[PDB]
Ligand binder design. Structure first.
Ligand code: OLC
Ligand code: OLC
Ligand code: RET
Ligand code: OLA
Ligand code: OLA
Ligand code: OLA
Ligand code: OLA
Ligand code: OLA
Length: 263
């Protein structure tokens, strides 16, 4: 599965290779550092919204484990031989990120629907359609990147299908946001709209990294992809979770929950 990604096609200078290593290991620290934050502030969240901060904790560990896994796979697969790091074993692939997205994405959507104050039949119903839409997006995206070396044509086609799901997923999310923001407390009706636009931006970096094989097929394209993934992870998971947390607390305060009001 690794011989199918462009990471296996190139040698890397010590600078390119250590930069990629430091990106992944930094992501681990950021994610686990934020996990502690979400764990601490959970006590300041009303039971109605407390599940939202817990799903962030799940996202943080899910991300940190796979970034940690990627970092160790990166240093196992390459060895500095004759002035460059060269592939040794076949143990590094990006497919492990797509497995991470399969898990974290439902949690990210869930935490959104919860602070939107959906409940009951609508929560279950809206969650089912979004998760299925997201899984169709992720799965077709995973199949396309298997061809990122061999058949760029198939990458583009599977990329097109994946984007169809992505567009439908966003129209559902946005529609639920704009039709349910008048229900949000403490002024969080204004914050949620900005969260939606934070999503649009952060999530759109992924398909751009997905296309790096097609417009920058060299060792600097590999660095660029990881840099885009790192920016995207931090905004779609950390910053997004922080703002979800703030909305969960603000509404808890406006709802009379004392620990939130005292914070
Ligand atoms: C031909 C080969 C087979 C191709 C097969 C894939 C093509 C269908 C792709 C997208 C349709 C998505 C439409 C399904 C979503 C409609 C339901 C929905 O979105 O409901 C949300 C609602 O707002 C919550 O209550
Ligand atoms: C790969 C080939 C396929 C490419 C074709 C892509 C077409 C892009 C069109 C729309 C994007 C929709 C973005 C979703 C933004 C949601 C806006 C929204 O939800 O509308 C407001 C709401 O309905 C009020 O209640
Ligand atoms: C870590 C959190 C999130 C939300 C990751 C999201 C990933 C996407 C929105 C990926 C999208 C793709 C598209 C739209 C088409 C090319 C294939 C991708 C799966 C990379
Ligand atoms: C406070 C919580 C912050 C602590 C999180 C950071 C902990 C240790 C991260 C180190 C993992 C390094 C992975 C090995 C790969 C490598 O470094 O080459
Ligand atoms: C088709 C794949 C299955 C996906 C189905 C998604 C299931 C989601 C179900 C409801 C989410 C409920 C969230 C947990 C309870 C918190 C709600 C609350 O107490 O306010
Ligand atoms: C772990 C549960 C996986 C979810 C399965 C149910 C939802 C699937 C959603 C869309 C399926 C898209 C079809 C992808 C299969 C074709 C790719 C291939 O050739 O193998
Ligand atoms: C993730 C992006 C989703 C959108 C993908 C856009 C689809 C691009 C459209 C096709 C342009 C024509 C493709 C040219 C042929 C290239 C394949 C080949 O080299 O054999
Ligand atoms: C399930 C959702 C749609 C799947 C459409 C599959 C089309 C991609 C075929 C590309 C190929 O395998 O040659």
């Amino acid at each position: 599965n690794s011989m199918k990604n462009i990471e296996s096609l190139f040698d890397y200078s010590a600078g390119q290779f250590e930069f990629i290593d430091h990106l992944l290991t930094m992501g681990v620290g950021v994610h686990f550092a934020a996990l502690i934050f979400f764990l601490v502030v959970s006590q300041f969240v009303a039971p109605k919204y407390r599940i939202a901060t817990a799903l962030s904790c799940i996202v943080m560990v899910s991300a940190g484990l796979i970034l940690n896994s990627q970092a160790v796979m990166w240093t196992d697969a390459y060895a500095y031989v004759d002035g460059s790091y060269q592939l040794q074993d076949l143990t590094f692939s990006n497919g492990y990120r797509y497995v991470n997205w399969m898990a974290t994405i439902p949690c990210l959507l869930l935490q959104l629907l919860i602070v939107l104050n959906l409940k009951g039949k609508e929560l279950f119903s809206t969650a089912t359609w979004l998760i299925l839409a997201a899984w169709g997006m992720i799965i077709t995206g995973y199949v396309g990147q298997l061809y990122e070396v061999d058949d760029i044509a198939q990458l583009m086609i599977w990329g097109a299908v994946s984007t169809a799901f992505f567009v439908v997923m966003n129209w559902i999310v946005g529609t639920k946001i704009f039709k349910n923001r008048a229900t949000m407390l403490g002024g969080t009706d204004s914050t949620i709209t900005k969260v939606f636009w934070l999503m649009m931006f952060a999530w759109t970096l992924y398909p751009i990294a997905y296309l790096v094989p097609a417009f920058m097929n060299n060792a600097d394209g590999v660095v660029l992809r990881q840099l885009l993934f790192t920016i995207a992870d931090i905004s779609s998971k950390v910053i997004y979770g922080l703002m979800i947390t703030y909305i969960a607390i603000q509404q808890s305060a406006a709802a009379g929950y004392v620990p939130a009001q005292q914070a």
